[PDB]
Amino acid sequence: TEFLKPRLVDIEQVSSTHAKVTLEPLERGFGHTLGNALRRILLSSMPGCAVTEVEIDGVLHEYSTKEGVQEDILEILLNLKGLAVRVQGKDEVILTLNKSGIGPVTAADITHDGDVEIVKPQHVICHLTDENASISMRIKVQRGRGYVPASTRIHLVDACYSPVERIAYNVEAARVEQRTDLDKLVIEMETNGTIDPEEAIRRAATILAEQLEAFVDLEV
Template sequence: MRIRWRGFEMPTRVEKDENTASGTYAKFSAEPFERGFATTIANSLRRVLLSSIQGAAVRSIRVEGADNEYAVIPGVLEDMAQIVLNIKKLRLRLHSDEDVVVRLEKTGEGPVRAGDCTPHQDVEIINPELVIANLASDVTFSVELDIGPGRGYVPAEQQSVDGKPIGTIAIDSIYSPVVRVAFDVNVARLGKRTDFDKLELEIWTDGSISPELALVEATNILRKHLNPFIKYFEIGREFENATATGLVIEGDNERSGKLSKQISFLDLSVRSENALRAANIKTIADLVQMDETEVSSISNLGKISAKELKKKLADHGLSFGMRLASSE
């Protein structure tokens, strides 16, 4: 099926090569593009994928027996500089918007691995086989890791350690879960014409996010930045919250005014917003009339995202399962 808009040939869909796809790699293709548009789209997506996808990383550490990054710990083969470099390679998946502290402690000769960390409900270690240090004797190696969400790369000099315990060492944080992005533009044929473009986009991640989800998130970030440039009388109407629900909270005009707003007003994560829109939940009124069980059962949402929604609604004085009255 061909899609045309104002004389432009548009891609009908994005396809993934299932034969080569894995949890950390995927190759996507889309066609046809008018000449030059594939390169424009690919460059924009590549920039966003590499710099703007949210991930998690260690921000600072506290190592027992070491007050600075140049210290040497008795019984540990590596010095602090090497330990810090190893910790920077730690890849994580964070199921919370809040900072968390994870403790790593091991006693006895042998390697200390990332998998030796004390389990935390909000943190998932993607590379548990990573060696943090090697113990040469029967000593105890203990370190606390301050972990938080972020984007891109943040050097140690910009990390905030104010209010942290004495001995806290700030380290460079590499948040981006996307390791590499490559694209190729080839000739595409449409009917008798051969002057169209075909885009092939390859994405590698560290495993904390799938290539598919990374692509969707990058596309949404790009779209959000283009929304202000769309004229009001075209598809940007939803940006003005023009949809009226006709529902109110009796005796509360302030909260009633929020019911007609789009769910984007809540500043949700890309995953949560996509799942709600896929379930045809567009306004806050649609959301607050559902109970918590119904929300948790929405496809691709899950319990963690449901908790996020509950907190976001509470910030505005709203909750699940609200009874709304007609404004008429």
């Protein structure tokens, strides 16, 4: 009772952070199981680092107003969440926002540390209103194997770990020769720029494989 295994024929990838990869041919029923399982893992468990918290140099609170910035503090916390952080063996790093002036602070406006990589110099952190303006603060990263909300750090910033911005799988019929109906599984995923999508898939179901390491034998 010999079995049918595909290997991905095409990765059709848009730009860099975006990828759409097709895997064909499958066995009937396998497209949905592979797609769904790989999606559930790709989403809620992926190793990565962003921002769990930042001290406010201006005030003590998430609700306040900064002199020289119209953005509400929660608004800036949002932007901080959208900052791409890939950290090396240093488990928890911390940076500073040091800059001031007549124009917005970007992600290239942050101090440069030893094991820290910002993928986007382009990123908008917050705008700078006129003149001197008091702004510089410090930002501490955090690690997770999954997604941890802001309210969950019990004893505030939403911690976005999983590099995946979006994951979708399209199952369509695949035609092989004398085989009538098969699965053609098309994965489509966007990332935050830290880990590229192509390898992201790989680690994603390597997790799945590792969860299955307690069971099978033979082929290997």
